[PDB]
């Protein structure tokens, strides 16, 4: 069992672009130096979210075929995947223990003024992802599959997005057969993680709406990206 040269090329373009994301030093130093309070902790979370959106757009632009889609469909895909992609990257950071600093960052997220209604399913999902011992190829492919979802709202030409997502699902299933021949349900488990990611959309949107204009968490820039 091997990937075809066409599949190897598609995977290499995805892997190269995914490897470009790096946690900036100034954000890392903030986790180490800032006062441990709800206000300071949330401000660090906000900075991490704005850095991730920029990273996500750069990654998405290098996805084979993304730039060939209708300009408004590109926006619709970025808008619709922003939250899911952030939780998937957060799962990767948790299970790779980044900035390495990880226990301090976890302590800040748990004391940022965010309710346990949203924090508890968050860490439960990271633990669930951790159990699958996902390779970097799996994180990158899953991120590309989340972004290139043809059933997002406001997409005009859905079959165009389908033509881009289907070869990625083909590569991912092939990598499961190559690297886990003893576990035939590994691909099904990864799909299981995709549906769990989709639940963070409602949960995250509900969390966002709840923040009052006078609350320290109220952030107009966060609202614009996430909705």
């Amino acid at each position: 069992m091997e990937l075809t040269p066409d599949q190897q090329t598609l995977l290499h373009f995805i892997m190269d672009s995914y490897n470009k994301q790096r946690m900036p030093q100034e954000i890392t130093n903030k986790i180490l130096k800032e006062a441990f309070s709800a206000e300071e902790n949330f401000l660090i979370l906000t900075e991490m979210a704005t850095n991730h959106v920029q990273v996500l757009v750069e990654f998405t632009k290098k996805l084979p075929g993304f730039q060939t889609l209708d300009h408004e469909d590109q926006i619709a895909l970025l808008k619709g995947s922003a939250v899911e992609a952030m939780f998937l990257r957060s799962a990767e950071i948790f299970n790779k223990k980044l900035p390495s600093h990880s226990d301090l960052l976890e302590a800040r997220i748990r004391n940022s003024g965010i309710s346990d209604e949203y924090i508890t399913p968050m860490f439960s999902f990271y633990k669930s992802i951790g159990e699958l011992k996902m390779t970097q190829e799996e994180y990158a492919l899953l991120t590309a599959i989340v972004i290139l979802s043809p059933d997002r709202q406001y997409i005009k030409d859905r079959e165009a997005v389908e033509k881009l997502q289907e070869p990625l699902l083909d590569v991912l299933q092939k990598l499961c057969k190559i690297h886990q021949p003893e576990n035939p349900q590994h691909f099904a488990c990864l799909l299981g993680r995709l549906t769990e990611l989709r639940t963070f959309n409602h949960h995250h949107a509900e969390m966002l709406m709840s923040w009052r204009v006078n609350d320290h968490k109220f952030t107009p820039l966060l609202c614009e990206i996430w909705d």
């Binding site: 757009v57 632009k61 926006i75 808008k79 990206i225």
Partner: peptide, 12 residues
């Protein structure tokens, strides 16, 4: 609408 995302997508 979505001015930040538009800028990020269209920049070089």
């Amino acid at each position: 609408d979505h001015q930040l995302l538009r800028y990020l997508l269209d920049k070089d």
